[PDB]
Amino acid sequence: GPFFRTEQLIIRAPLTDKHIYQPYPSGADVPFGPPLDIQILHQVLDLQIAIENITASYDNETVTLQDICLAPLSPYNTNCTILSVLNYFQNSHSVLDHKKGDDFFVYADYHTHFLYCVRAPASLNDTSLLHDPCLGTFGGPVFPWLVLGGYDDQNYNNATALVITFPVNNYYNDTEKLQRAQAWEKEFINFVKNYKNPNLTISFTAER
């Protein structure tokens, strides 16, 4: 329930079209929605990283997302919990671009990894040539219905919107931590409100 402030983003790709994944060497075509385009995913990834790098100032000290976010594995895994489809690739450009094939056709890429991870989001290893993990960076699974929208039934590949959620710890017995998170939220609102990319339509919500 509560005790968790949500900084949320809804991202769509108006200037990008759906495309078809065709498995090698044959098989049924699999459609993929506009925001599941590889370049869109790279841009969204860099926006997410940028948000992770936002710094505010409170009480003569600097405040980063790491200082207010939900890090359930602290202090050995200090990675902030980020609910995002990019976390299926550990928020890594490298894992996102990871692909395998011969010199002519791709046998496995981010398409197959996506198809596997949405069915087993807690898997530490997909059962493909990639051997990549599905688990998020924060040590927990990212469920597909929380990071994708607009898809039909449970065909998550037909998603038309991406949902990126930064949960930060909420407090009722510590006004200082609340005001700190509120200052960071101010910097976050300024940043996202001054970010313009013709390939991305972005809706932002803080805990105003």
Binding site: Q22, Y24, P25, S26, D102, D103, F104, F105
Partner: protein
């Protein structure tokens, strides 16, 4: 149109061009029940009395032999005997049948000479598609 190709080991010759028609976009899309033409321009480094064309379809890294109607290159637009430093244009035309599957694969085309060595060897990406 001239298509991109990988040389799989032309020891006794140098490929100048691999022209597949019609193939507007690459990898070449082969509609089922429809004939396509291949024209290989190469320069021979040796003199050979015969030339035997051999075709394989590579799937999952494994070559699958594909018999053609005529394997003799002397009846394929090459004036035998092949002379050194001369330039030739191997010509052929094959129909995509409806029995073929709708798969992606790599077509490998060789032209062997007297010592059974490659005057040319090339591979191109090909996808047999359905017109339905």
């Amino acid at each position: 149109e001239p298509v991109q190709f990988k040389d799989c080991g032309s020891v006794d010759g140098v490929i100048k061009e691999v022209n597949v028609s019609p193939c507007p976009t690459q990898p070449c899309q082969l509609s089922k029940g429809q004939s396509y033409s291949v024209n290989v321009t190469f320069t021979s480094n040796i003199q050979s009395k015969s030339s035997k064309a051999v075709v394989h379809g590579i799937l999952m890294g494994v070559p699958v032999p594909f018999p053609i109607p005529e394997p003799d290159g002397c009846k394929s637009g090459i004036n035998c005997p092949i002379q050194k430093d001369k330039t030739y244009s191997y010509l052929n035309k094959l129909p995509v049948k409806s029995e073929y599957p709708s798969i992606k694969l790599v077509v490998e085309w060789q032209l062997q000479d007297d010592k059974n060595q490659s005057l040319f060897c090339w591979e191109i990406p090909v996808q047999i598609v359905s017109h339905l």
